[PDB]
């Protein structure tokens, strides 16, 4: 499953792009 995370993805995940969500920037993680 994919999630938005600050400031990076958690172990096991990979960063696929960026989220713009509620005025902040996030790592898009899958």
Swiss-Prot record:
Q: Which residues of the full protein are shown?
A: 65 to 94 of 94
Q: Tell me what happens on changing residue 26 to A.
A: Almost complete loss of bactericidal activity
- Origin species: Homo sapiens (Human)
Tell me the protein's name.
Answer: Neutrophil defensin 1
Phosphotyrosine: residues bearing it: 21
Out of the domains of life, which is the source? Answer: Eukaryota
Cystines in this chain: 2-30, 4-19, 9-29
Q: Which residues does this entry mark as bearing ADP-ribosylarginine?
A: 14, 24
């Amino acid at each position: 499953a994919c999630y938005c995370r600050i400031p990076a993805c958690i172990a096991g995940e990979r960063r696929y792009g960026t989220c713009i969500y509620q005025g902040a920037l996030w790592a898009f993680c899958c």
